[PDB]
């Protein structure tokens, strides 16, 4: 059918407003829900329907700034929300010590990402502190953790580190040689990329791996032409109509972005079947409340609404901005970032 | 102790044992974004959690408070961290915690925080004795749970428990030969033990796979494994494979088989074989067969592959 654009704009609007206690499990990841919504509005060119200033303040209140003595540098970045109970402070005053307050790599990523989407210039972001915190997260094998207190480590966070280093336009945030090593070691016998060495290759990790390399501008340098051809084959094989994340697994709307974006970065998305993909993504559209679901006749959510839209974007949907496949922001936003970068270089 | 849904449950703000502590409220400032509305009970538990955290109170009452915070939201990684801090401070029985987390994970098998917690505990106890069985159960309510397979590979590698995995794999491939996760597990085991250099093993495996392919010819997983373990030594270096496949074509044909053939022919062209121009035609003929009739959804891709081959070997 058709793309109920306005319906979706209303959907993201609600998301930025108030959620039912049934989404309590997203509490510590509220910032990434904000991203899905904001970047989603951006993608629909409707950022006007929100007060960019209020949101920018909220986001800045989530930054873990270094304390007076700067003894907490290894823990700076952004929080997912205010669940720790720290007094609201839009990065105005110095950091207030707290035994367990520290950033989360996915939040620093979506945080900065959100600020740029909203037009902020990142002047209030303690870039050095963030980069200091980032470095602290990388492990000996090249991958990253999400928090300094410890967590699981895998390709998801390698992509987060990459996005952060790219946006702050400074790669001192990671040991790129080790990161690239990790990404290589994750390639499977079937040629896809997994969360880590030996694991089952997966559409999500493949995107993270490929996108990270592109962000570092070393795709061609890390993988041989033969290797890239095998990876392309693995990706292109994910399309059934919509896309699944692993062989013999049911399609899921969000993979139209995860895999589609990878195919785009590999310059062969053009050879995929557009109609069947578009038809599937739409079959998961909620014509009543808006947004998209992973499967048709299933409840919608911010994640699938956003990625479903970005999936459509890849095929240049009427009424949706072109999405920057590696940075996961609209091209418009990616450019505002280019300018923002030039500015600093003075 | 006192369950969150017990008739006699009492808000922490009304409990004697918590009279001395001042609850700490959360505040998203003037204009809150993506704000979640919380019930009295929920907000209550967490307002006290924030209090205890802020004071880094390593108390026994705090340890219990976490159980409630976890029931309200097992995705709060900070809660789990603090709980681990307390597990050490209060020197709690880790074998007991293993039961706790085993129950939790069963209820939420797709939660990142809970699998991490279990991994940390197993490291602490240096005891993997119950891991393989636990994972096998979880893999029963979802044989493709990525969290489960990831944890399984960690345990097996960390405590070198390869002895029975290849057998477990054989069993699961019988329950569902299309489970890509199991095929990956198979490669994981073999390459981490005997390896594939032993021509005896390579042979056993290629044979095993061809047998599975014959049972269910349309199975990307089986084909990817086959090509996987041979692609690096050189697909063209196995003359009997090319023929055995060409023979299967009639009855067990599928896009995967045709694709494999294309890849074999390309390996040949790559290694300046006999009949360069003749081979390229056999390849192109198949690419078109894929695009026009066998794997139409990838029509534009296969044609692209064809043009690629043609402009590289002419």
């Amino acid at each position: 059918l058709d793309f109920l654009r306005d319906r979706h704009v209303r959907f993201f609007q609600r998301c930025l407003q108030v959620l039912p206690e049934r989404y309590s499990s997203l509490e510590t990841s509220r910032l990434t829900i904000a991203f899905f919504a904001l970047s989603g509005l951006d993608m629909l060119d409707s950022l006007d329907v929100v007060n960019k200033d209020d949101i920018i303040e909220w986001i800045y209140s989530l930054q873990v700034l270094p304390t007076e003595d700067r003894s907490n540098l290894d823990r700076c970045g952004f929080r997912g929300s205010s669940y720790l109970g720290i007094p609201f402070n839009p990065s105005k005053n110095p950091g207030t010590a707290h035994p367990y307050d520290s950033g989360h790599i996915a939040m620093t990523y979506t945080g900065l990402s959100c600020l740029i989407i909203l037009g902020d210039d990142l002047s209030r972001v303690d870039k050095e502190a963030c980069l200091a915190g980032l470095r602290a997260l990388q492990l000996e094998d090249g991958s990253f953790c999400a928090v300094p207190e410890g967590s699981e480590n895998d390709m998801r966070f390698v992509y987060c580190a990459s996005c952060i280093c790219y946006m702050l336009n400074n790669w001192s945030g990671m040991d790129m040689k080790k990161a690239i090593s990790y990404i290589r070691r994750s390639m499977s016998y079937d040629n896809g990329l997994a969360q880590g060495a030996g694991l089952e290759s997966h559409g999500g990790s493949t995107f993270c791996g490929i996108a990270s390399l592109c962000l570092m501008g070393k795709l061609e340098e890390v993988f041989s032409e033969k290797e890239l051809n095998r990876i392309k084959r693995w990706c292109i094989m994910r399309q059934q109509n919509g896309y699944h994340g692993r062989p013999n697994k049911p399609v899921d709307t969000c993979y139209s972005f995860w895999v589609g974006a990878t195919l785009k970065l590999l310059k062969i998305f053009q050879y995929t079947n557009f109609e069947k993909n578009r038809n599937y993504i739409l079959s998961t559209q909620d014509r009543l409340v808006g947004g998209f679901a992973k499967w048709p006749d299933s409840h919608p959510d911010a994640l699938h609404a956003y990625f479903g839209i970005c999936g459509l974007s890849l095929m240049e949907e009427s009424g949706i901005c072109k999405v920057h496949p590696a940075l996961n922001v609209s091209t418009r936003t990616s450019e505002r970032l280019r300018d923002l970068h030039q500015s600093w270089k003075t | 102790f006192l369950s969150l849904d017990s008739p006699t449950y009492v808000l922490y703000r009304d409990r004697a044992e918590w009279a001395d502590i001042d609850p700490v409220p959360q505040n998203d400032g003037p204009s809150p974004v993506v704000q979640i509305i919380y019930s009295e009970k929920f907000r209550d538990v967490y307002d006290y959690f924030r209090a205890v955290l802020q004071r880094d109170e390593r108390s026994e009452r705090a340890f219990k408070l976490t159980r409630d915070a976890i029931e309200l939201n097992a995705a709060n990684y900070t809660v789990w961290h603090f709980r681990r801090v307390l597990l050490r401070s209060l020197q709690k029985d880790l074998q007991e915690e293993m039961n706790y987390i085993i129950a939790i994970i069963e209820e939420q098998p797709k939660n990142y925080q809970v699998w991490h917690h279990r991994r940390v505990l197993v490291e602490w106890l240096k005891d993997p004795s119950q891991e393989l069985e636990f994972i096998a159960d979880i893999l029963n309510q979802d044989a493709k749970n990525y969290h489960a397979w990831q944890h399984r590979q960690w345990v097996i590698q960390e405590f070198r428990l390869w002895d029975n995995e290849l057998q477990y794999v054989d069993q699961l491939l019988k329950e569902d030969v299309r489970n890509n996760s199991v095929w990956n597990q198979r490669h994981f085991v073999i390459s981490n033990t005997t390896g594939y250099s032993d021509r005896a093993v390579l042979e056993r495996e290629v044979q095993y796979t061809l047998e599975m392919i014959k049972l269910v010819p349309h199975n990307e997983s089986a084909w990817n494994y086959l090509k996987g373990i041979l692609q690096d030594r050189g697909l063209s270096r196995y003359p009997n494979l090319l023929n055995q496949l060409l023979d299967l074509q009639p009855s067990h044909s599928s896009p995967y088989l045709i694709a494999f053939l294309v890849d074999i022919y390309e390996d040949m062209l790559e290694n300046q074989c006999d009949n360069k121009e003749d081979i390229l035609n056999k390849a192109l003929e198949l690419c078109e067969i894929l695009a026009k009739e066998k794997d139409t959804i990838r029509k534009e891709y296969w044609r692209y592959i064809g043009r690629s081959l043609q402009s590289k070997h002419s």
């Binding site: 999400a146 998801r156 899921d252 959510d301 994640l303 | -």
Partner: peptide, 5 residues
């Protein structure tokens, strides 16, 4: 649903 974190 798809849990990413």
């Amino acid at each position: 649903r798809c849990v990413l974190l």
